[PDB]
Amino acid sequence: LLRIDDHDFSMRPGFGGPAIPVGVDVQVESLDSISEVDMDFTMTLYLRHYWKDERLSFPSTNNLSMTFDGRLVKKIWVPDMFFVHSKRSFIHDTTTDNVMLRVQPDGKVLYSLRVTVTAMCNMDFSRFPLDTQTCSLEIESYAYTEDDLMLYWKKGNDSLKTDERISLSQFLIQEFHTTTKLAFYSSTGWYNRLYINFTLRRHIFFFLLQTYFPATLMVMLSWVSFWIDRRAVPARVPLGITTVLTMSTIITGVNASMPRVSYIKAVDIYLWVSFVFVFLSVLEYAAVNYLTTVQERKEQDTHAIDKYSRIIFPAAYILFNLIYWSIFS
Amino acid sequence: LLRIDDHDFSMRPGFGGPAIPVGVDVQVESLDSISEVDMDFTMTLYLRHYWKDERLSFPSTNNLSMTFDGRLVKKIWVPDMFFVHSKRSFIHDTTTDNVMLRVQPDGKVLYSLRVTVTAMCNMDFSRFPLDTQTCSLEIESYAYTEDDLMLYWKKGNDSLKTDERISLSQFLIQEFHTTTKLAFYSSTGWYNRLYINFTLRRHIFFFLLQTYFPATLMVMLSWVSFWIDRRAVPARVPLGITTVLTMSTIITGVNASMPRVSYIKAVDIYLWVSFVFVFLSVLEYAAVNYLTTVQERKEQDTHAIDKYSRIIFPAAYILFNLIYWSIFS
Amino acid sequence: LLRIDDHDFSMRPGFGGPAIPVGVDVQVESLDSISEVDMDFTMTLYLRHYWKDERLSFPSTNNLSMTFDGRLVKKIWVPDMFFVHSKRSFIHDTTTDNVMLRVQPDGKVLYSLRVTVTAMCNMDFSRFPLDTQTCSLEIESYAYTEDDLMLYWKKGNDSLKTDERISLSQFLIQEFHTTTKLAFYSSTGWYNRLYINFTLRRHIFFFLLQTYFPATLMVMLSWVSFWIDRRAVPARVPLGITTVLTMSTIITGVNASMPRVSYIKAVDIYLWVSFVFVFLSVLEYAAVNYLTTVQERKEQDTHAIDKYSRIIFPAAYILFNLIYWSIFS
Amino acid sequence: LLRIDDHDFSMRPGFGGPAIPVGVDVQVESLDSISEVDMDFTMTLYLRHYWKDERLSFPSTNNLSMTFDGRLVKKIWVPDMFFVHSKRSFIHDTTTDNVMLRVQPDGKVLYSLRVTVTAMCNMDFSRFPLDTQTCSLEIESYAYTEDDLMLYWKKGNDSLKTDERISLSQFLIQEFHTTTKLAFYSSTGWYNRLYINFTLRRHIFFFLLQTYFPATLMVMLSWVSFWIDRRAVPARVPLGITTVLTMSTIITGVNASMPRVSYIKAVDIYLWVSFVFVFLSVLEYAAVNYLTTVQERKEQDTHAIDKYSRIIFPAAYILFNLIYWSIFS
Amino acid sequence: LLRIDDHDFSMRPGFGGPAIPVGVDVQVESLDSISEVDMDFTMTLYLRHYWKDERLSFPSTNNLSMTFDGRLVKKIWVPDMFFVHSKRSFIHDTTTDNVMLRVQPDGKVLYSLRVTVTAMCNMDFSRFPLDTQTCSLEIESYAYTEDDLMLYWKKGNDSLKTDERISLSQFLIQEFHTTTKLAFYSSTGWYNRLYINFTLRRHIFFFLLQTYFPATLMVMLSWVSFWIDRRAVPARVPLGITTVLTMSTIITGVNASMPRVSYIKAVDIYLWVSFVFVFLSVLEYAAVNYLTTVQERKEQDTHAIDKYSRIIFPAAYILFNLIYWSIFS
Ligand SMILES: CCCCCCCCCC
Ligand SMILES: CCCCCCCCCC
Ligand SMILES: CCCCCCCCCC
Ligand SMILES: CCCCCCCCCC
Ligand SMILES: CCCCCCCCCC
Ligand SMILES: CCCCCCCC
Ligand SMILES: CCCCCCCC
Ligand SMILES: CCCCCCCC
Ligand SMILES: CCCCCCCC
Ligand SMILES: CCCCCCCC
Ligand SMILES: CCCCCCCC
Ligand SMILES: CCCCCCCC
Ligand SMILES: CCCCCCCC
Ligand SMILES: CCCCCCCC
Ligand SMILES: CCCCCCCC
Ligand SMILES: NC[C@@H](O)CC(=O)O
Ligand SMILES: NC[C@@H](O)CC(=O)O
Ligand SMILES: NC[C@@H](O)CC(=O)O
Ligand SMILES: NC[C@@H](O)CC(=O)O
Ligand SMILES: NC[C@@H](O)CC(=O)O
Ligand SMILES: CCCCCC
Ligand SMILES: CCCCCC
Ligand SMILES: CCCCCC
Ligand SMILES: CCCCCC
Ligand SMILES: CCCCCC
Ligand SMILES: CCCCCC
Ligand SMILES: CCCCCC
Ligand SMILES: CCCCCC
Ligand SMILES: CCCCCC
Ligand SMILES: CCCCCC
Ligand SMILES: [Cl-]
Ligand SMILES: [Cl-]
C-alpha cells in the first residue's frame, strides 16, 4: 500500500529547504521513585509525535486514518528526540515493541512510544525535613538544529495529561506545567528544548514520631535528677550519663541516612541543642557535689542550685521550642 | 507449505473493514515476590492467543493442527498485547525463544509465549500487620482501538488456571478471578482491557514472637520495682531507666523496615502505649523519694503510692489489651 | 558440503508422520549458590542432544564425524528444550557462542551448549539448622507434544556426570540421580519431562559457636547471683537485668537472617527456653528481698530460697539439654 | 545522494599510504559518582570526530554542510576510539541511537556520540579526610598504530568544554585540562593517547560534626571524675568505664566505611590518642583507691593525685590538638 | 581485496586433514576485585591469536601486514576459545567492538580482543587472616579436539605480560606464570588447556588495629578489679560483667563478615581464649565474696586469692601470646 521501495529515507522531508515542524504531546503514567543520596527521579510516560511526509501518501475514498503493524518504523524516516541530562532510559518490548504508527492518505503521520527515564535533580536540604523541591524533564533533538527542525508543543498548555493513579508515599505532588527555551552548543549550533515541570512537598509525620519525640523525652528524663536527694550519688550520676549516651545514638541514627552535605540541616540544630541541654545537667550535679564537700571540710535540705535548676531548665527548653517552630513553621 | 512470500503482513486481517476478534487464556506458573517499600509484585505465566487468518491456509486430507518451528513468527502478522501499569518484563530465551505456533488448514492460529512481569500495587498499612491486600494484572492492545481489534476471554470464567505449586512464605493467597472493562485515552481512543484479580492475607506469628512479646516483657519487668524496699535507691532507679532505654530500641527496630507513610499503623499504637506505661513507673519512684525526704525534713513500712501501684498498673495494662484485641481481632 | 539451501527447515524431520526421538545427556560443572530468603539455587552445566535428519547427509569414504563452525545452527532445524519452573537463565557467549555441532555422513547429529540456570526449590525449616533439603531441575520441550517428539535419557542412569571440583562451604552434597515423568496442560496436551535430583545437608559448627554457646554462657552467668550476699542489693539486681537484656539481643540477631515463616524453628525453642530460665532468676531475688523486709518489720545467714536455687536451676537446665539433643540428635 | 554502493568501506582512507589525521573535541555533561571502596568514578560526555574522505563527496551549489539520518554510520568507514583502563561504558539509545553525522560536498565529515564511562582512579588516604585527589580519562585507537592513524586535539587547549551544572555534594572540582602522550605495546606497536585531567577536594564539615566533636566530648566527660569525692567508689568507677566503652564504638563506626588499607589514616591518629587519654583516667582512680586503702591499713581531703590531674590532663589534650592541627592544617 | 565471496568459511583450514596449530599470548590490564563470600575474582585482559589460512592471501609488492576494519571478522573463520570454570564475561563495545584484525599477503592472520572475566577460586581460611591464596585462569577450545586443533603458548614463558599499574588495596600480588595440561570429557574427547597462575598475600595491619588490640585492652581492663577493695561490691561486680558483655560484641562483629565455614579460623582462637580469660575474673570475685561471708558467719586486708591473681592472670596471658605468635608467626 505504502510505496516504501521508491524513496531514500536517509533524508528528511524538505531536505535542502526550510525546516520541518514537529509537534509533541505527552501523558505521564507514573512517578516511580526518588533518591536524595543520588539526587534523581524516575518517570514512565507515553510520548507522541506529529508531522507530514508526502512520500507516505496513498489513495482511498474514505479520507480516514489507518494503523500499520509497526515493523515499518525502521524503514521510513522518523524524528530523533532524546532526554537531556538523563542517567538512563529504555523502551518497553513485551510482548513486542510498544510502538504505534498511524498514517492519513495525504501523508500526515502519528507516532507513539512508551518509555521509562531516570533524570538528574539538584536538591537543597537546608530546611530538611520541612523542605520543598522542584523538578523538570528536558526534551530535545539530537542531530538537527532549528534551521532544519522546529519543535513545539502541539496543543499549547493542553499538551500534558496525568494519570489519576499517580502517588508517592512520602511526598505531595503538585503544579505540573510545560515551558520552552532555546539552547546553544559551541561546536554545533542552536536547538529548541521543551520542559515538563513539577513540585514536591514532604510529609513530616514520620520524622516527628521517629526523631523529634524521643529527643524531647531524653531531655525530660534528665530533669528528674533535680528531684532526688543530693546524697544518693550512685543514683544521680548514672541517670545523667545514660541520657547523654542515648542522645548520641539518636544523633548518629539520623545522619546515617542522608548525603554528606557541607552545610547544617534543620534537624541537626534541634538534636545538637538537645544534646547540650542534657550535657549541662551533669556539670550541675558535679558542682553540687563539690560544694557540699567544701561545706563538709569547713564543718569538720535542698541546695540553691537544685532549687533554681528545677525552674530554669524547663523554661529555657520551652523558649527554644517556641523560637524553633516560629522559624521553621 | 505456508505461502509466506505472497502477502503483505504489515496489514491486519480484514484491514479496511470490521474488527478482528482475538481470544485469550492464561495459566499462572508462579507468584515470585512482593515489596512493601516499592509497592509491587512479580509474576510468571503462560499467555495464549487465538484468531483466524485465511492467508495462512494450506491443503491436507486430515483436517488436523500442525506445529511449526517458531522462526516464522517474525514473518506473519501477530497481535500486540502489553501489560498496563507495569514496571518491567521479559520473554524467556533459553535454549531458544519460549514461543509456540500452531496452524489449522483453514487458517485458524494458536500462539503461545512464557513471560515474567513486575507490576504496580497500591497498599494500605493502617492495620499492619493484621492487614489484607488486593491486587490485579492488566492486559491491553497497544496500537489498535475497539474499532479494529476486539479482545475477550476465550472461555469465560474458565480462562484462568493456576499451578498447584504456588506459595508464599508470608501470605495466604486466595480469590483468583477475571474481569473486563473499557478504557479511554484522550489523544487516541477507546480500548478493551482484561483483568486478573487476587487477594493476600498476612501471617501474624512472626510479629507476635518478634515484637509483641518482648514489649510486654519489658512492661512486666518495670512492675518488679514496686516490690523492692524504697530505701534501695541505686537499685530502683536503674531498673526503670534500663527498661525505658530498651523499649526505645524495640520501637526503632520495627519502623526501620517499612515505608515512611504519613499515618499511624496498628503496631505503632501498641508500642507507644507500652512506652508510656514504662515511662510512668520512673516518675512514680521519683515522687516516693521526694515525699520521703519531706517526711525526713519534718521529723528532723510501705508507702501508699507503692501499695496502690501494685494493683493499678497491671489492671490498666490488661484493660488496654482487651480493648486492643477487640478492635483489631 | 551440507545442502542447506535445498530444504524447508521450518518443519521437523518426519513432519506429518510419527514422532522424532531425541536423546539427552548432561555434565554438571558447578552448583553456584543457594538462598533461603528466595528459596532457589543456581547451577551451571553442559547439555547435549542426539537425533538423525537425512536432509543433512553428505558423501565421504571415511564414515567419520565432522565438526562445523557453529553459525549453521541458525539455518537448520534444532530441538526446543526449556527449563521448567526456572527464574532466569542464559547461554555463554565469550569469545563466541559456546555451541558445538557435529554431523555424520548418514545425517546423525550431535548438538551441545553451556548454560547457567536459577531454579525454584521449596524448603522446610522446622528442624533448622539441623535440616536436610532435596532439590531437582526439570527439562521439557516447549512446542511439541509426545505425539511429535519423544524425549529420553540417552544412556539410562549413566547419562549424568559431575565435576570433581563441586563444593559448597555450608552444605554436604549427595545423592545425584535422574528420573522421568509425563505432564499434562489443559489447553495444549501431554509432554515428557526429565528430572535431575540431589540432596543437601547443612554443617552445624557455625551455629554451635555463634548461637548455642553464648546463650548457655548467659544462663550460667545468671546462676552466680545465688552465691552473693542477699544484702548487696545494687549488685544482685543489675547482674540479673543485664543478662535478660543480652539474651534479647541474641534472640534478635538470629531471626533477622531468615525468611518470616509461620511456624517455630528448632533454634527458636532453645533460645526462648533460655530466656525464661534467665527471667525467673530476677523474680527469685525479688521474692527474697520482700521476705527479708517482712522479717525486718516483724523484728522491729542464707535464705532457704537461695539454698534451694543453687541446686534446682542447674539440674533443670541439664535435664532440658538432655531432652533437646535427644529429640534433634 | 551519497554513493555508498560504489566502494569498499572495509579499508580506511589512504589505505596503503600515509596516515590519516583525525581530530577530537569534547564537552563534559556530568560527573556522576565516586567510590573509595572501588577506587573509580563515572562520567557522561559528548565526543566528536573530524576527518576527510573523498569517497563521500557530492555535488551542490551552496557549499554548505548537510545532516543525514544516522543509519548510514554502519555502512561507511568510521574511526575506532576506546577508553583505556575503563571498567564499563555504553552509548545511549532512547528514543534512537544518540548519534549524529554531517558531511560537506568535498567529503569533510563530522561525527558525534553521547556516552557514559566508569574509569579507574588510584587514591591515597594518608591525610583522610583532609585529602586531595587527581584523576584522568584516557582515549586511544584500538586497531591502528601511529603509522596509519594520527590522533590530536582539534583546537589545542580550547578542545574541552564543561557544563555549568556540574556538581558533587562532597567535593570541590577544579583544574580541568588536556594532555597527550605516546604509548607502546610489545606485541603490536606505538599509539597516540589523549588525556583529560582534573582535581578534587573534600569538604570536612561532615567529619567535624560526625567524628571529631563526639570524641572530644567523651574526653571532656572523663575529666569530671577528678571533681568527685574519692569515697564514692560506685560512682567514679562506672563514669570512667562507660566512656572507654563508648570511645570503642566511635572508633568502630568510622573505619567500617572505608577500604582496608595497609597504613594509618589521619583520623585514626586522633581517635586512638583520645582512647588512651580516656583509658588513663581509669588507672588514675585505681591508684587513688589503692593508696587510700594502704593509708587505712597504716592507721588501723583531696588526694595529691586528684589535685594534679585536674591541671595536667586538660593541658596535655590542648597541646595535642595544637600539634595535630598544625600538622594537618 | 580479500576474496571473501569465494569460499565456505563454515569449514576450518585443513578440514578433513591434520590439525591446525593456533598460538596464543596475553597481556593483563587489571585485577579488579576478590570475594571471600563468593570465592571468585575478576580480571580484564587483552587476548591474541595467530594462525595461517591461504584463502585470505592477496598480492602486493611490499610483503607487509595490513589492518582491516573489523566488520570482516563475522565473515571469515575464527578460533573458538572459552574460559573454563568461569561465572560470567563480556567483550567491550564502546565506541565499537574492541576487536582487531591484521593479515599478511601469504595468509598469516593476527586477531585480538579485549575482555573481562569473573572466575572460580577455592579458598582456605584456616590461617585467616594470616593466609596465602593461589589462583588460576583456564583457556580452552569449545568445539575442536586435539585431532583438529592444536593450542599452544606462542613464545613459551615470554607469552604473558602484566601492566605496571596493577594493584589491590588488601593483597600483595606475586608469582605470575603459565602452564599447560590435557583434559578429557567422557562424551566428546581430549582437549588442550592453558593456565595462568598467580599468588596473593594478605596485609594484616587492618586486623591488628581493628580486632586484636581491643580484645587485649578488654582483658587488661578486667585485671584492674584485683586492685580494688573487696568491700566495694557494687563497683567490682559491674566492672567484670561489662567486659564480658563487650567481648561478646567483638566476637560477633568479626564473624559477621566471612563465609560460614565448617572449621575454626586463627582469629576465632584468639578471641575465644580472651573470652574465657575475662569470664574467669568474675568467678574469682564471686569466690572472694562467698569466703568473706563465711568468715563473717564464723566471727559472729587483702585476701590470698586477690594477692595471687595479681600475679597469675597476666603471666598466663603473656605465655598464651608467646605460643600463639610462635605458631602463626
Ligand atoms: C569537664 C570539666 C568539668 C569541671 C567541673 C568543675 C565544677 C566546679 C564547681 C565549682
Ligand atoms: C520530668 C519532670 C519530673 C518531675 C517529677 C516531680 C515529682 C514531684 C512529686 C511531688
Ligand atoms: C512482674 C510482677 C513481679 C511480682 C513479684 C512478687 C514477689 C512476691 C514475693 C512473695
Ligand atoms: C591493668 C593493670 C592495672 C594495675 C593498676 C595498679 C595500680 C597501682 C597503684 C600503686
Ligand atoms: C556458674 C556457677 C558459679 C558458682 C560459683 C561458686 C563459688 C564457690 C566458691 C567456694
Ligand atoms: C516535640 C515535637 C513537637 C512537634 C511540634 C510540631 C508542630 C507542627
Ligand atoms: C538560619 C539559622 C536559624 C537558626 C535559628 C535558631 C533557632 C533557635
Ligand atoms: C502479648 C501478645 C498477645 C497476643 C494475643 C494475640 C491474640 C490472637
Ligand atoms: C482507629 C483508632 C483506634 C484506636 C483504638 C485504641 C485502642 C486502645
Ligand atoms: C551448649 C551447646 C551444646 C551443643 C551440643 C551438640 C551435640 C552434638
Ligand atoms: C515437636 C515439638 C518438640 C518440642 C520438644 C521440646 C524439648 C524440650
Ligand atoms: C574538636 C574539633 C576541632 C576542629 C578544629 C578544626 C580547625 C579547622
Ligand atoms: C607523619 C606522622 C604525623 C604524626 C603527628 C602526630 C601529631 C601529634
Ligand atoms: C596484641 C596484638 C599483638 C600483635 C603482635 C603482632 C606480631 C607481628
Ligand atoms: C592447629 C591448632 C593450633 C592451636 C594452637 C593453640 C595456641 C595456644
Ligand atoms: N543536541 C545535542 C548535541 O548538540 C550534542 C553535541 O553533539 O554537541
Ligand atoms: N493503548 C495505549 C496507548 O493508547 C498509549 C498511547 O499512545 O496513548
Ligand atoms: N510445554 C509447555 C507449554 O505447554 C506451555 C503452554 O503453552 O501451555
Ligand atoms: N591499542 C590497544 C591494543 O594494542 C591492545 C592489544 O591488542 O595489545
Ligand atoms: N570443550 C568443552 C566441551 O567438551 C563441553 C562438552 O560439550 O562436553
Ligand atoms: C545557620 C546556623 C544555625 C546554628 C544554630 C546553632
Ligand atoms: C511547643 C510546641 C508548639 C509548636 C507550635 C508550632
Ligand atoms: C487513630 C489514632 C489512634 C491513636 C491511639 C493512641
Ligand atoms: C490478653 C490477650 C487476650 C486477647 C484475646 C484475643
Ligand atoms: C512444636 C511446639 C514446641 C514448643 C516448645 C516450647
Ligand atoms: C549436654 C550436652 C550433651 C548432648 C549430647 C548430644
Ligand atoms: C605515621 C605514624 C603516626 C603515629 C602517631 C601515633
Ligand atoms: C584547639 C583548636 C584550634 C585549631 C585551629 C586550627
Ligand atoms: C585446631 C583446634 C585449636 C583449638 C584451640 C582452642
Ligand atoms: C607479645 C607479642 C610478641 C609477639 C612477637 C611476634
Ligand atoms: Cl551503688
Ligand atoms: Cl550501677
Chain A contact present for B252, CB below 8 A:
yes
Residues D160 and D96: beta-carbon distance below 8 Å: no
Report the alpha-carbon angle B253-B122-B194, nearest 5.
150
Distance CA A215, CA A203 (A): 20
C-alpha cell at C15: 513432519
Q: Which residues, 6+ apart, have CB-to-CB distance to D44 below 8 Å?
A: A87, D28, D29, D30, D32, D114, D115, D116, D117
The residue ranges of every structural domain in chain E are 1-203, 204-329
Looking at the DSSP bridge assignments, the partners of residue B84 are B138
Breaks (C-N over 2.5 A) in chain D follow: 300
CA C168, C171, C173, C179: dihedral to nearest 10 degrees?
-110
**D234 touches A at CB < 8 Å:** yes
Contact A226, A309 (CB under 8 A): yes
Closest atom of ligand 17 to CA, residue B141: 1
Q: Name residues contacting ligand 21 (CB within 6 A).
A: A 264, 269
Q: Which neighbouring-strand residues pair with D26? A: D47, D160
Q: Are C218 and C278 in contact (CB under 8 A)?
A: yes
The b/e string for E88-118 (b: 16+ C-beta within 10 A; e otherwise) is ebebbebbbbbbbbebbbeebbbbbbbbbbb
* E317 Cβ inside 6 Å of ligand 4: no
Angle A150-A154-A160 from CA coordinates, rounded to 5°: 125
Residue pair E120/E39 in contact by the 8 Å Cβ criterion: yes
Judged on CB neighbours under 10 Å (0-12, 13-18, 19+), E304 is exposed
β pairing state of E86-91 and E20-35: unpaired
Is the Cβ of E200 closer than 8 Å to some Cβ of chain C? no
Of C219, C250, C246, whose CA–CA distance to C320 is shortest?
A: C219
Backbone angles phi, psi at D266, to 5 degrees: -70, -25
In angstroms, the separation between the Cα of residue D242 and the nearest Cα of chain A is 9
Where does chain C show beta strands of DSSP type E?
A: 20-35, 40-52, 66-68, 81-84, 86-91, 99-103, 108-120, 132-141, 149-153, 160-162, 171-185, 189-202
With beta carbons less than 8 A apart as the criterion, state whether C162 and C189 touch: no
Question: Would you state the cell numbers that stand for residue D328, as one nine-digit string?
Answer: 594537618
Task: Tell me if the bond preceding D95 is cis, omega within 30° of 0.
Answer: yes
Atom index in ligand 8 nearest the CA of residue B216 equals 1
Helix/strand/coil for B55: helix
List the grid coordinates of C216: 548457655
Q: Please report the number of interchain residue pairs, chain A to chain B, with beta-carbon separation below 8 angstroms.
A: 121
Residue type, A307: K
Q: What span, in angstroms and rounded, lies between the C-alpha atoms of D129 and D171? A: 11
Runs of H (alpha helix) within chain C: 205-207, 213-223, 233-255, 266-299, 304-328
Which method resolved this structure?
A: cryo-EM
Q: After which residues is chain B broken (C to N over 2.5 A)?
A: 300
Ligand 9 mean position to B269 CA, how many Å?
8
Measure B324 CA to ligand 24 centroid, in angstroms: 9
Measured in angstroms, the CA of C210 and the nearest CA of chain B are apart by 20
**Annotated binding residue B65:** no
Q: Is the bond preceding E95 in cis, omega lying within 30 degrees of 0?
A: yes
Give the type of residue at C124. D
**Alpha-carbon distance B110 to C189, whole Å?**
13
* Least distant ligand from the CA of E311: 4
CA-based end-to-end distance of chain B: 67
Helix, strand or coil, per DSSP, at residue B273: helix
- For B306, residues 6+ apart whose C-beta sits below 8 A from its C-beta are B226, B230, B288
Nearest CA to ligand 19 atom 1: D142
CA distance C62 to C55: 19
Cα(A325) to centroid(ligand 6), Å: 8
Q: Report d(CA A267, CA A259) in Å as an integer.
A: 14
Do E222 and E236 form a contact (C-beta atoms < 8 A)?
no
State the DSSP string of D281-293. Answer: HHHHHHHHHHHHH
Rg over CA atoms, chain E: 33
- List of chains touching B (3+ CB pairs within 8 A): A, C
Mark which residues 14-73 of E lie under 8 Å from D by CB. 25, 27, 29-30, 32-33, 44, 48, 66-72
- Give Cα B101 to chain centroid, integer Å: 35
Give the β-pairing of B66-68 and B108-120: unpaired
Chain D residues touching E253 at Cβ < 8 A: 252
Contact by Cβ (8 Å): E115, C119: no
Question: Cβ of A165: how many Cβ atoms within 10 Å?
Answer: 10
Across the interface, do D224 and A286 touch by the CB < 8 Å criterion?
yes
Of C82, C283, C297, nearest to B98 by CB-CB distance is C82
**C-alpha C156: how far from its chain's center?**
27
Q: Strand, coil or helix: what is D120?
A: strand
Q: What angle do CA E194, E199, E203 make, to 5 degrees?
A: 160
Beta bridge partners of A21: A150
Please tell me whether D48 is known to bind a ligand: yes
Q: Rounded to an integer, what distance in angstroms lies between the CA atom of residue D136 and that of residue D134?
A: 7
Minimum distance, in Å, between the CA of residue C61 and any CA atom of chain B: 34
List the beta bridge partners of residue E285: none
The answer for D 88-117 residues in CB contact with A (under 8 A) is 92, 94-96, 98-101, 112, 114
Half-sphere exposure of E162 (CA within 13 A, CB side): 16
Residues of A in contact with B114 (CB under 8 A): none
Count of alpha carbons within 13 angstroms of residue D137, beta-carbon side: 25
CB C112 within 8 A of CB C48: yes
* Residues 6 or more apart in contact with residue C56 via CB below 8 angstroms: C2, C76, C103, C107, C109
Task: Looking at the CA of B325, name the nearest ligand.
Answer: 24
> Residue B30: which residues within 8 A CB-CB, separation 6 or more?
B43, B44, B163, B165, B166, C85, C120
Beta-carbon contacts of residue A155 (< 8 Å; ≥ 6 apart): A25
Q: Are B195 and B180 in contact (CB under 8 A)?
A: yes
